């Protein structure tokens, strides 16, 4: 987190000998030395952007990024360090490759309405950073508060079906915590020996809260991982309607933020900037809680997912979600989820009557 | 850990509403504002010294300090903040009160040799900061390494009964770890949601190791909590001989450090400076593993300890150790342990034959 130019780069250079994370793969004595004296206009330095990676040796299988931006300029300034990491974590997205950001919910081709008897629920999460303020791993309580004020104010104005309420984390607990908890709402502390190693859980829970309509269908976290972490989920599997309220909520949030002089920082190369290079672009996670009692058992499962450009986590229901973030647009992405999920179900079904199946090649569904 | 003078102190001022730690008790909007722009010659700022406290609300019963010095100057600079905390944590040690530092092992009055059938082992721990370098919660990998180099070099020279070997933490594990472990040697990571919240476990385990004679009777940790954490323990209960090897080892360590231009930072007011204001002075912990199967059961136990100026932890054997650090000297302190322990045993014994006991008033044994 610190470094003294009075020392020779070789001495300050970290001992990444046993590290398994992107930052480790590209950071070199040569590179270090180059930008070990450059700094963002808000004092952010490489030693800072690389510190969480140096502390977290990661793990052989699951590979972590290894760094975080402390402000919008961190990308331009430490370009020589982030660029390779991005084009190493995003299918080789090149320093030239553009980025499509399409938030028109209509362009969501069909994504009709899939089998409820198979999809427990669909949701769309995303992050946003209000510009003019530093990012979580570096903003002062000062900044952090302003972000919340602005954020809350902004939200409070929202009427219609987006009429909700703010809930500061300090003034909270089970009476709402547990509720909000077992009712999946509020957010806990990034306690992870990775997130707290990021140095961004400082002054918890000051200036942090959950906001949400009365319908509890559109939640928004303030100052957690990034300035804003809007989430639009619904029960069942109306991925279409979900991704609708999503695009519109954002459309409106931003409009307020814009008229106040604080638009969400985005640039046509990276798209939307956030703390983690691996959530850059649309920073979107469209997903559903499918119930594939059998499709999973099938050994070609993985590849099917792979060829569909999807992921999943432990939850026989799974959390299949879109895999791309950079290069692909929001709509395209959510799309890759509906089509992909529909095939998962059509299959799962055919598996229900001991029948064989047929898939396809990557870059679809 | 950061702060922008562009913000009004009221906005950057932490929300200590629900905090139980010294820093919380004395930090006020008035004080904050005063030194919220002062900084040590190594860039350490209040926001830094208070950050670990703001993050750790502590606990109602056990009260924690709430801050740490990042360099020797942190005490002079943030004097208005540390002074009350020290004279609030050390029986009111005033900004004027001197401090005795007596390392002559001879002055240890008697402390003859106590009952082995009652004292499992005696040990003397202490900390030391090499001057010219910042303290653990702020030194760069650069500095940290220099400290180890110097430290190791220094140690390696030591011959006689102080002939030992260094053991960097990276090149380690059970083959020695476990050994060194079950054989109480090496040191683990301050993983505590308090120490790691101090921001001083960075780049672990780079530049950190255990050093010790072949007799494993004098251990020294490099760059753990403070620059050096020398420990002199022995089995049985020869507190005298223990506190001997202790004083001499230090006497010698320092002599090298001094001839190299890096004396242990000490000043006649605070004595020996270290990261935690609560270990200031002699930063000494003389203690023994007494076995008081009954003295403990006796309800006056606590007060007896109290009047003896002692403490203890869970280990029917206990870890009774000296309670004072500031004002009292090393010898006086170790003393308060032998005499105090001897009474604990003389009592425990009388308890063995269903007999009553007689104690005394504070300020002794």
From Swiss-Prot, chains A, B:
SUPFAM superfamilies for the chain: Glutamine synthetase/guanido kinase, Guanido kinase N-terminal domain
Q: Which domain of life is it from?
A: Eukaryota
Q: Which InterPro entries match?
A: ATP-guanido_PTrfase, ATP-guanido_PTrfase_AS, ATP-guanido_PTrfase_cat, ATP-guanido_PTrfase_N, ATP-guanido_PTrfase_N_sf, Gln_synth/guanido_kin_cat_dom
Q: Where does ATP bind?
A: 121-125, 184, 229, 285, 319
> What reaction does this enzyme carry out catalytically?
creatine + ATP = N-phosphocreatine + ADP + H(+)
Instruction: Write down the EC number.
Output: 2.7.3.2
Entry keyword annotation includes Ubl conjugation: no
Group of enzyme by EC: transferase
Ranges of residues in domain Phosphagen kinase C-terminal = 118-351
Q: Which UniProt keywords apply?
A: ATP-binding, Cytoplasm, Kinase, Nucleotide-binding, Phosphoprotein, Transferase
* Family under the similarity heading: Belongs to the ATP:guanido phosphotransferase family.
- Return the protein name: Creatine kinase M-type
Q: Which organism is it from?
A: Homo sapiens (Human)
Gene name, per UniProt, is CKM
């Amino acid at each position: 987190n610190k470094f003294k130019l009075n020392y020779k780069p070789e001495e300050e250079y970290p001992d990444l000998s046993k590290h398994n994370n992107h930052m480790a793969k590209v950071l070199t004595l040569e590179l270090y030395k180059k930008l070990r004296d450059k700094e963002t206009p808000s004092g952010f330095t490489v030693d800072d952007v690389i510190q969480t990676g140096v502390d977290n040796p990661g793990h052989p299988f699951i590979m972590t990024v290894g760094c975080v931006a402390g402000d919008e300029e961190s990308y331009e300034v430490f370009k020589e360090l982030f660029d390779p990491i991005i084009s190493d974590r995003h299918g080789g997205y090149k320093p030239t490759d553009k980025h499509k950001t399409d938030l028109n919910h209509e362009n969501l081709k069909g994504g009709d309405d899939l089998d409820p008897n198979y999809v427990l629920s669909s949701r769309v999460r995303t992050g946003r950073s209000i510009k003019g303020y530093t990012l979580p791993p570096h903003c002062s309580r000062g900044e952090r508060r302003a972000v919340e004020k602005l954020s809350v104010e902004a939200l409070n104005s929202l009427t219609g079906e987006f009429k909700g309420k703010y809930y500061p984390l300090k003034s909270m607990t089970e009476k709402e915590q547990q509720q909000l908890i077992d009712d999946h709402f509020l957010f806990d502390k990034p306690v992870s020996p990775l997130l707290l190693a990021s140095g961004m859980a400082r002054d918890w829970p000051d200036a942090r809260g959950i906001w949400h309509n009365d319908n509890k269908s559109f939640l928004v976290w303030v100052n957690e991982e990034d300035h804003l972490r809007v989430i639009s989920m619904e029960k069942g599997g109306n991925m279409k309607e979900v991704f609708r309220r999503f695009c519109v909520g954002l459309q409106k949030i931003e409009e307020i933020f814009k008229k106040a002089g604080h638009p969400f920082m985005w640039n046509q190369h990276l798209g939307y900037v956030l703390t983690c290079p691996s959530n850059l672009g649309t920073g979107l996670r469209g997903g559903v809680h499918v119930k594939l009692a059998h499709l999973s058992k099938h050994p070609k499962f993985e590849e099917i997912l792979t060829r569909l450009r999807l992921q999943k986590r432990g939850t026989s229901v799974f959390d299949v979600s879109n895999a791309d973030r950079l290069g692909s647009s929001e709509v395209e992405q959510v799309q890759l989820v509906v089509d992909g999920v529909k095939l998962m179900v059509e299959m799962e079904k055919k598996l229900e009557k001991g029948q064989s199946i047929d898939d396809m090649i990557p870059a679809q569904k």
